Design a protein around this ligand. Structure first.
Ligand code: A1BC8
Ligand code: ZN
Lengths: 807, 355, 93
């Protein structure tokens, strides 16, 4: 099998943002990292002026700016998830603009397990070295000096194995690190000096101190203060060589502070964001001395307002703050001196679209022209919403829900979408549960609730704890034209909605919304009860038609030739819709794995679990039971699966990879007829949550599968012929010899299948983005690529422009 | 000695061993022939590792699988002039058999491919937000597990699955659930006695479950420790009826009757006078068992108790023994002891086993 | 040899197990006689003895081996039933 993978919408989720002087010394820049993309802007007081946007062959993990002594502008350091390090420089040749790789080199080790807190990348203030913390027990040091083009580094043994955060201190004669670590005694702050000549750790400027057992971040305060600030769940403490000051502000106890940014270059003010969108400012009050020295007088924290759930923050000129958000739209906010008539000092100025995370989606034709439009379940918590993507090229419309959407399906006969959603409520003294804010499930025109005395759990005393978050699930009906929340049906207490399907069954004319749920209780590890509720949308309200009680979680459901096929724990059960509007068990097939994923094409069904266990089944009419055709048990975390054709199955497995399994051609054998050979391997660099058959356009390529990712990237996979794959595979090796990669990262090393303890070259996949880049190069370069292998530059223009038409 | 995986390595084979050994199971050996002394002494000064062979069809010498066993102890008795090598070994890595050659001295050397131990990372490592990386270190029981799940699997909101599903594939949660189930059978179980590593814990549990040889083979075929833990936990919840192996359908006892009389657990290995080893499972009550002969205290594995042979009421196959107390003050006055090799784990009223 | 030998070895093995209540002594008398059968017949009377008794004698040894593992006295009784069937047929001549 041979496939062509191309990006339709680039990743929108922001994972990093920094400010500095990268393009010139006289311009203030704003650099934004969006997984594999880097955007460069110039702050001018009227907003952000786009200047340069590039793509890298790697998942940007670290991104920091620094200015060595001899440099006129700032240099940019980037480390990737595959440990590709590079020092970059912005170069403008009048009209042409180019990112230059001053230094580069892979910094991974042959041994060592990735650290628990992930990659930490810090640069010394006086640009003497780059410190990296990749594995537990080691601290990699890349010495910063002129002729170090290969980014050669050395490792220093670190005794403290469970380091949470680390930073380089300011105003120190020798490079000094300050970090928090956890040992069986608790958490502690410690300092260490780094001597490049010695290649070892010397004693730090101040002795080890104890911190809050929940201390999570370290902020090195620039001069005149020096020292460091340790932030935990309930305390903010300062520490330097001769002083310490601690505060326990009750205004921070509701949520954990997880991101910070410095406002004043001297460290007088610092913005702080939590997991729920609250934005705070920390003031380092100063008591100046007669000799110009400054001591820390007191610490004060004040809540400013509400922003989108912030991943990273960056102060820009005059009250303007950029809010990078992984879970919602990124923003440009204004920090007003006087509060508005609501009480917030923060006011939104601009909103930047963020599809990420895409949990589910579907393709639908609404204006009824022939062009399919994608409707995704995006965001989470207050950022949760629906996004309609149409074919600047892609037009996006947002429908805010203020709660987490989970599943989506389109009902043609009702002109409305069905969306499973969840809202967080908290127990109150009254004895019930109260919601944090109004949302789609609480603002519907009409609402309904489930009832079930017959579904009383035995081991559940229902003595729910006080002040505990409770997740309430609902099924929302949303109009396809106005997108208003028409109806909201709440499920039973402790009931978790998992699967959703809209279909007709048997001889019944009525299309129904069917939901597969699970009864989740804290005491029970695995659900022992579940429900398959059938719903009919009539008179702008949802009415239950049939309710079937099952002994397990209904992880997935699908329409199978007029019947309902559901997956309850390990069993794959088929049901028939009788003339009395009831579900009746037709047959059961017990599997040896958890039936999480369930797809069907024709008479065969694909079953999968979270550990990439793929088993094929076929419903035999004579037997009245299912039969295993083939199986592959290659243990690895699988996030999504899809049937490409009768003998090809596309999936997404751990370390942001795509794979295709093929059914053997039955070459006078039986043990290989039940074996699925892996023919496709590719490192996408995105975490796929959903595959979807369909297209957004009005046949050299066979088939069309769209997919949504955590970073909001939308991609497309299509099959190719034998002759078409070899020509495009030849053109990739040719384009890689000419195209200049930012950081000088080889395309073969970026797309090769990679896991923590395994790496193999990519097979059966064509990087469509690389092929489409051929058109975006100068005419003399276009001919350089097609030199020999007959095939002129002009001939390969309509070939690539034909592949462009697919998306 | 832990050789590289997915590579074909030649390992010496011990001729007098034809029994399936689970990684990390005590196998005391007592060799005597000089053909099994000059090789056991050659390995002691090189790598200290011999190969135990598993035969699917013991009657036709069909060997397609096996597991290595590192030599960790050496003692040589000079009794009556005849050299006796007394060595104890422990199982390390599973291997597959491809081709076994025969030498001209009396040893077989086979090129075996070591099947990898698939160590997967955490399910949240590829989806954890960088801002929340610093919230993964928990500071240092029913409500503690609720907060453990709520914090470790918080990022499940970015995927298509909930937090409770990810707990079903979490090594720490699975091992804790198995420990609770094992505690029901052994009130005298010590936590320090069980390994903390998911690889060693899974193999230790596989050698403690009262299951037939076919199921022991199935668990060893599994490559990941997560799937092996899940299958072991599924056996404990579903295979509640223990039946006679020969009859396949005659029930003998139930899971709820399993208990531990001594401090070696509910199914310890004991050796009879003739030297045969019996992994004996102790239960309070049994059905379809007839008693043969009279009680005897000779060679009793449990002090203060007399044994009486027990057999299948339908097929007359040996199942184990009944233990009657000699003193009227012993609390478990009467209990049963069943040899593992005589029983068939069965799922009562057909569901199968999940990985 | 073989006839009078097996005959005199079963009388002594019965006197040790039934009379003296000593399993070890009985197996000591029986083991060499069974080992002789494993070597094979080398005389006509020896060959004639393996044709009629050989199969019955090798099954009582398997029943003795079953007792050594199980510890079931009935398995030794099954071996002794076969030993007495052969002992009587030997006594017939
Ligand atoms: C003296 O016993 C024998 C003579 S021939 C075989 C045996 C024998 C005894 N056992 C068990 C019975 C139960 C027990 O507590 N200890 C054992 O050793 N298994 N086989
Ligand atoms: Zn039986």
């Amino acid at each position: 099998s041979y496939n062509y993978v191309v990006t339709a919408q680039k990743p929108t989720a922001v994972n990093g943002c920094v400010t500095g002087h990268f393009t010139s010394a006289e311009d203030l820049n704003l650099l934004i990292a969006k997984n594999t993309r880097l955007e460069i802007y110039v702050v001018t007081a009227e907003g952000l002026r786009p200047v340069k946007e590039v793509g890298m062959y790697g998942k940007i993990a670290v991104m920091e700016l620094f200015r060595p002594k001899g440099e006129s502008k700032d240099l940019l350091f980037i480390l990737t998830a595959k440990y590709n390090a590079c020092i970059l420089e912005y170069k403008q040749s009048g009209e042409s603009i180019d990112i230059i790789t001053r230094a580069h080199g892979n910094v991974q080790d042959r041994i060592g397990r990735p650290s628990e807190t992930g990659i930490i990348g810090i640069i010394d203030p006086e640009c003497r070295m780059i410190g990296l913390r990749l594995y537990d027990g080691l601290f990699k040091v890349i010495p910063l000096d002129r002729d170090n083009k290969e980014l050669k580094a050395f490792n220093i043994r670190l005794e403290e194995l469970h380091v949470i955060d680390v930073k380089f201190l300011y105003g120190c004669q020798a490079p000094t690190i300050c970090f928090v670590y956890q040992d069986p005694q608790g958490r502690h702050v410690k300092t260490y000096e780094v001597s490049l000549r010695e290649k070892e750790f010397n004693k730090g400027p101040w002795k080890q101190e104890n911190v809050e057992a929940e201390a999570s971040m370290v902020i090195a305060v620039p001069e005149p203060f020096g020292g460091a600030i340790i932030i935990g769940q309930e305390s903010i403490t300062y520490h330097n060589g001769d002083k310490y000051l601690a505060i326990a502000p009750p205004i921070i106890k509701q949520s954990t502070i997880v991101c910070h940014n410095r406002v004043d270059p001297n460290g007088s003010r610092y913005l702080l964001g939590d997991m729920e969108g609250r934005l705070f400012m920390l003031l380092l009050e100063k008591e100046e001395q007669m000799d110009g020295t400054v001591t820390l007088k007191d610490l004060r924290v004040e809540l400013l307002g509400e922003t989108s759930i912030a991943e990273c923050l960056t102060y820009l000129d005059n009250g303007v703050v950029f809010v990078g958000s992984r879970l919602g739209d990124s923003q440009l906010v204004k920090l007003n001196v006087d509060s508005n008539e609501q009480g917030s000092y923060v006011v939104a100025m601009e909103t930047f679209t963020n599809l990420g995370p895409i949990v589910d989606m579907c393709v639908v034709d609404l204006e009824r022209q022939g062009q399919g439009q994608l409707v995704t379940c995006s965001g989470a918590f207050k950022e949760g919403s629906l996004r309609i993507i149409r074919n600047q090229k892609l037009h996006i419309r947002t429908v805010p829900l203020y709660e987490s959407p989970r599943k989506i399906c389109y009902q043609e006969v009702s002109q409305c979408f069905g969306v499973l959603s969840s809202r967080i409520e908290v127990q109150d003294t009254s004895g019930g549960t109260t919601a944090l804010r109004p949302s789609a499930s609480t603002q519907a025109l009409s609402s309904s609730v489930s009832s079930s005395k017959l579904f009383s759990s035995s081991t559940a005393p229902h003595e729910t704890s006080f002040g505990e978050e409770v997740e309430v699930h609902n099924l929302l009906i949303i109009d396809q034209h106005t997108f208003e929340v028409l109806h909201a049906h709440q499920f039973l207490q402790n009931e978790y909605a998992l699967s959703l399907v809209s279909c007709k069954l048997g001889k019944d004319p009525n299309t129904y919304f069917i939901v597969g749920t699970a009864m989740v209780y804290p005491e029970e590890a695995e659900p022992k009860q579940g429900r398959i509720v059938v719903f009919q949308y009539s008179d702008g309200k949802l009415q239950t038609v049939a309710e079937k009680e099952v002994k397990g979680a209904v992880y997935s459901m699908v329409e199978f030739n007029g019947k309902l096929l559901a997956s309850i724990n390990s069993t794959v059960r088929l049901y028939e819709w009788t003339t009395e509007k009831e579900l009746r068990t037709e047959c059961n097939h017990y599997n040896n794995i958890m039936a999480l994923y369930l797809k069907t094409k024709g008479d065969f069904i694909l079953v999968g679990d979270l550990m990439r266990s793929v088993l094929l089944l076929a419903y035999k009419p004579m037997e009245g039971n299912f039969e295993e055709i083939a199986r592959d048990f290659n243990p690895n975390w699988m996030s999504a699966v899809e049937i490409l054709d009768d003998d090809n199955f596309l999936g997404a497995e751990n370390a942001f990879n795509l794979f295709v399994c093929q059914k053997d051609s039955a070459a006078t054998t039986d043990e290989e007829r039940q074996h699925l050979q892996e023919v496709g391997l590719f490192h996408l660099g995105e975490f796929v949550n959903v595959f979807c058959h369909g297209s957004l356009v009005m046949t050299p390529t066979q088939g069309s599968v769209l997919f949504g990712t955590v970073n909001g990237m939308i991609g497309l996979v299509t099959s190719l012929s034998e002759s078409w794959y070899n020509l495009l595979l030849d053109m990739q090796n040719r384009l890689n010899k000419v195209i200049k990669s930012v950081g000088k990262i080889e395309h073969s090393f970026w797309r090769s299948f990679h896991t923590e303890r395994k790496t193999e070259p990519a097979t059966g996949f064509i990087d469509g983005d690389l092929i489409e880049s051929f058109l975006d190069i100068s005419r003399p370069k276009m001919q350089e690529v097609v030199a020999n292998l007959e095939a002129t530059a002009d001939d390969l223009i309509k070939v690539v422009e034909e592949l462009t038409r697919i998306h | 000695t832990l050789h590289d995986d997915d590579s074909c390595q030649v390992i010496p084979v011990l001729p007098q061993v034809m029994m399936i050994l689970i990684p990390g199971q005590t196998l005391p050996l007592q060799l005597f022939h000089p053909q099994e002394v000059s090789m056991v002494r050659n390995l002691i000064q090189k790598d200290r590792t011999f190969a135990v062979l598993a035969y699917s069809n013991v009657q036709e010498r069909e060997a397609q699988f096996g597991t290595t066993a590192e030599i960790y102890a050496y003692r040589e008795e000079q009794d009556f002039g005849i050299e006796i090598v007394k060595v104890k070994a422990i199982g390390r890595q599973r291997f597959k058999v491809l081709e076994l050659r025969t030498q001209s001295d009396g040893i077989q050397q086979a090129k075996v491919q070591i099947l990898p131990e698939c160590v997967l990372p955490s399910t949240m490592s590829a989806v954890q937000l960088e801002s929340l990386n610093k919230c993964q270190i928990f500071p240092s029981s029913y409500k503690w597990w609720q907060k453990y799940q709520k914090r470790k699997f918080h990022c499940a909101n970015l995927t298509s699955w909930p937090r409770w599903l990810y707990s079903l594939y979490d090594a720490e949660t699975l091992m804790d659930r198995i420990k609770k189930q094992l505690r029901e059978w052994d009130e005298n179980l010590k936590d320090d006695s069980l390994p903390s590593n998911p690889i060693d814990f899974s193999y230790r549990v596989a050698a403690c479950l009262p299951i037939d040889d076919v199921l022991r083979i199935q668990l060893l075929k599994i490559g990941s420790a997560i799937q092996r833990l899940r299958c072991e936990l599924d056996i404990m919840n579903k295979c509640t009826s223990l039946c006679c192996k020969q009859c396949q359908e005659t029930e003998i006892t139930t899971k709820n009757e399993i208990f531990s009389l001594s401090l070696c657990g509910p199914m310890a290995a004991y050796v009879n006078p003739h030297g045969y080893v019996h992994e004996t499972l102790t239960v309070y009550k049994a059905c379809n068992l007839n008693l043969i002969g009279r009680p005897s205290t000779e060679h009793s594995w449990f002090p203060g108790y007399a044994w009486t042979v027990a057999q299948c009421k339908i097929c007359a196959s040996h199942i184990g023994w009944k233990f009657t107390a000699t003193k009227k003050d012993m609390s478990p006055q009467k209990f049963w002891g069943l040899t593992r090799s005589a029983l068939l784990p069965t799922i009562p009223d057909k569901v199968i086993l999940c990985l | 040899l073989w006839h009078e030998m097996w005959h005199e070895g079963l009388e002594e093995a019965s006197r040790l197990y039934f009379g003296e209540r000593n399993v070890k002594g009985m197996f000591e008398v029986l083991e060499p006689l069974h080992a002789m059968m494993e070597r094979g017949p080398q005389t006509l009377k020896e060959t004639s003895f393996n044709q009629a008794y050989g199969r019955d004698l090798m099954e009582a040894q398997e029943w003795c081996r079953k007792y050594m593992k199980s510890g079931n006295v009935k398995d030794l009784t099954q071996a002794w039933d076969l030993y007495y069937h052969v002992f009587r047929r030997i006594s017939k001549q």
